[PDB]
UniProtKB/Swiss-Prot annotation, chains A, C, E, G, I:
Entry keywords, A to Z: Disulfide bond, DNA-binding, Virion
Protein's recorded name: Major capsid protein 2
The organism's place on the tree of life at top rank: Viruses
Organism the protein comes from: Pyrobaculum filamentous virus 1 (PFV1)
Function summary: Self-assembles to form a helical, filamentous nucleocapsid. Together with capsid protein 2, wraps arounds the DNA and maintains it in an A-form. Capsid proteins probably maintain the DNA in A-form by non-specific desolvation and specific coordination of the DNA phosphate groups by positively charged residues. This certainly protects the viral DNA under conditions such as the extreme desiccation of its host.
GO cellular component, one term: virion component
Compartmental location: Virion
UniProtKB/Swiss-Prot annotation, chains B, D, F, H, J:
Name assigned to this protein: Major capsid protein 1
Source organism per UniProt: Pyrobaculum filamentous virus 1
Keywords: Virion
Major localisation: virion
Assembly, per entry: Heterodimer composed of major capsid protein 1 and major capsid protein 2.
Subcellular location: Virion
Gene Ontology CC annotations of this record: virion component
Its job: Self-assembles to form a helical, filamentous nucleocapsid mesuring 400 nm in length and 20 nm in width. Together with capsid protein 2, wraps arounds the DNA and maintains it in an A-form. Capsid proteins probably maintain the DNA in A-form by non-specific desolvation and specific coordination of the DNA phosphate groups by positively charged residues. This certainly protects the viral DNA under conditions such as the extreme desiccation of its host.
Length: 126, 119, 126, 119, 126, 119, 126, 119, 126, 119
């Protein structure tokens, strides 16, 4: 829709993004405490999704999203590995359909990114 | 001076509080907000069956089974079916029949409401 | 509902949280006296629920809520262990039906988190 | 500067007194407030019955038996049944018949009034 | 009733309790003279109820209240031990019906909390 | 800064004098306030028999027997019956008949008036 | 008769009930004090009619009317238990002729709605 | 601005009270209005046969059996026969022969009135 | 007829509905409280009619009308399932005459719309 | 400024209410309005034969079969016969003889009434 487009255009974002950029270089803006809390939690998700570089081919969004989903359960204060293996076998089955990928090689990329044994995902596959 | 992802997140916040884009981001939509109403309807529909299912069988009401049955309703709509099979092994035995009651025995009411929410 | 949602959004909580955060970083806001009374009472509840991490499987909200409930009776100025064991046997019976959990293993987690002897809960179970 | 749970409780309070979300949190729902009315009704139903039970048997009226009889009225609705049995061993002997009178012999009045309170 | 509820809400109790707390931390509020008279008189009643911790079981509000009524008669400027023993023998009778309590063990807790001899209460029991 | 029980009483008073909540705590009820009317009645009804009972027997009027006869009327309603027995041994011998006159021989007038006040 | 129908039409009650609705939304009309005396007195009759949900079958208006007439005698300032039981046993006889309803099951629903002992209704039934 | 079914119901009401279409909706018809007269006629004739039925057989008069006897008259006119067959089991035994009296034993008087009313 | 057509035409409903729409856009009209009581009560009937989408063929106005009459009895303050089952089996007989519809497939769509078990409608069919 | 079809629909409506072209659009014709009379006459004659048909064969009256039979009358007048052949299979079996009765067996009365309307 264009009506939702025009209401954010009149708010003047291009000028306002340039002011806050200039204020940061003149040391008037410090790092907000929301951002320092953000990079501590997110840093484990960013390096774990870069470990799926060797998966080739098609739209790999489903393989990427389920590895990000399964890692979130293991990082809970009370980790649920039963639900963590649930999203993982969705990533193994979605990786298996791509041209050039084997069921054994998708078990290499998924279990390497999560950092668990290969047989832990092979148990729930059936 | 610097450009890393922490300062990119910070300067992204600083322009929102400057140009007031968070409040005009909600008050310019007026169409996506109806999805909150349909969401608050299905959660009431799942919950009243969840307490009714516990009273016919004499089992105590297990909290969080209203949340599990709503996740399985959304994954059934997308087609992630081996995601379903592992969660059905995770819940207790007497509550497995409730989860397929949400997916299939309330197909006509509950899945139709999810079909109108994403639409 | 939307009309209850819109009435909190027009109060402008996103900017008001951002300005309140900046005031703390510029040393203009001290720790409230309600917060000091909060963390002294709640610190015993937070670590007692992190000890239920080895319980695996299903929605564990009923196991978690009853251990928080049963510990509150022991922390009253006149503690009642009779009503404390009443919610505790609800935590054991709800734990038994999860897949992978035994009756003896649920007695380890419940009596371990409460910090009491295992034979106390077995008396009231029947 | 800092991020611990003590100041997160503090800074969460500080936005509330700033934007005045507490008073607009009560006045904007204003449909859930009839749950106060049905709650003040049921407690009067239990209390007048508890003194009538104390004069038919000649026993002195035991305060705090209202809260026990209302706790078991809510647990019976949810289904927490072995939570009930340990409390029933805790009260004295002559008041056990009053507790099963609240749960069962006022099923039609008191439990029905709970079913409208959660609706 | 909601109408008696709504009228106390519009007085702004949450905000004004926050401001008076902040004034205390900035040394603008001293201890009121009503509070200094209160804690001196009440300190004998606060530690007498905490000595009833070993009475177990049921709603013990009647055993707790009758001890506080019995202690109040002894602390008048002209103490009446006869009316103090009146509510005290009600506290022994109310304690006696609880599961796990004997007539001798309730006589220990009541006479220990009031700080009198046991044979004083046994006279008026009959 | 500090959190003890003395300042909690102090800071509890400070929100009352700020919001003016003592006066609106009384003028918003207006239904519990008729209990003062019924309480002012039975104080008169107990007192007028107390001077009448003292004049038929020729004994001097004993002040403070009004509150004794009113305490036993309330404890009879609740069921605290052995608190009655120790108090009846405490009064003089010629006034024991007056206390059972208030409780039993004014059952219909005085104790029903209590039964409307608590209701 | 359409004559009496017409003379209520020309009074314009559709427009009048719309306008008095708008006055209530604009806070120009408060709750009449006749209404406060109504719902305080009627609410015991409304929630007792809802206790007959398990009476099944035919026109149940006679069962509803006589269980409402039975409460009216118990709610007087001088209640008449005998005249209340006269209207009560009429509801039982109206209930037992319905299909699927037993005489014993109708004694449950009437005494459950009135909140009395069942044997009081069975004594007058003969 | 917005167009949902809640606001569509409101703007249809504002367009009625603005131009006064309810009172000119009734007063312009004046031929359909005579259906109210015939409806009041059949209503009286059904009610008198109910109390006639109740006194010859000594059974108490059952209120709301007029509405059952009127609906089964109208469905017989439409032709919904298995709708009739379930209701005849739902009513009690002694009143069943009255319900077929309205359909069949006054086929002449009552059905001709409905056949005139819808005409 | 034309004379009944004219007297509503001369009222100017085209112009008056135009101003009522513009007044809503200028926020001089709020939503009616009759509308709030309407859409709360109607919405159960709205989506159950949409659940008959797979009934194919003929004029389906009788199947839609008789399943709405069945919901009206179950939604009463005192629900009557027997009078509800009377209108339900009328819709099943109306559905089965349509081309392509089986008697078993009509029991699926009707019980799926009402949300009941299929045996409750099969019992009354006979 | 702008000219699109959403705006072209609006700017046509603004000039209708400005010069009052709707009410003079109806009142200046005064000859086309007699078509509303003739359509109301055919509409009743189809409904009366539908209940006459449903009562002779004992079948329940099917609502909307008068609306179906009217469209088949008008397409028979135009000549869209293969559209008739599909709807004749879509309606149920016992009502097909009614649908050819409106087209053929009242070729005299009903087709003439349509033919005088379109003229």
């Amino acid at each position: 829709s264009v009506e939702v487009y025009r209401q954010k255009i009149e708010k003047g974002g291009y000028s306002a993004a340039y002011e806050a950029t200039r204020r940061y270089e003149r040391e008037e803006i410090e790092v907000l405490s929301w951002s320092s809390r953000w990079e501590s939690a997110w840093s484990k998700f960013g390096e774990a999704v870069k470990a799926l570089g060797k998966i080739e081919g098609a739209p790999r969004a489903l393989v990427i999203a389920k590895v990000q989903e399964a890692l979130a359960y293991m990082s809970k204060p009370l980790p649920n590995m039963k639900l963590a293996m649930a999203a993982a076998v969705q990533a193994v089955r979605a990786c298996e359909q791509l041209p050039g990928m084997n069921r054994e090689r998708c078990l290499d990329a998924v279990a390497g990114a999560l950092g668990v044994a290969k047989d832990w995902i092979r148990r729930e596959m059936t | 001076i610097a450009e890393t992802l922490t300062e990119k997140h910070t300067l992204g916040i600083e322009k929102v509080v400057a140009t007031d884009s968070w409040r005009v981001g909600i008050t310019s939509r007026e169409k996506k907000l109806e999805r909150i109403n349909i969401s608050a309807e299905i959660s009431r529909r799942i919950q009243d069956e969840a307490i009714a299912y516990a009273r016919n069988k004499g089992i105590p009401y297990l909290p969080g089974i209203n949340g599990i049955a709503w996740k399985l309703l959304r994954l059934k709509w997308l087609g992630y079916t081996d995601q379903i099979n592992v969660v059905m092994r995770t819940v207790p035995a007497e509550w497995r029949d409730f989860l397929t009651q949400i997916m299939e025995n309330t197909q006509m009411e509950s899945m139709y409401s999810e079909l109108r929410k994403v639409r």
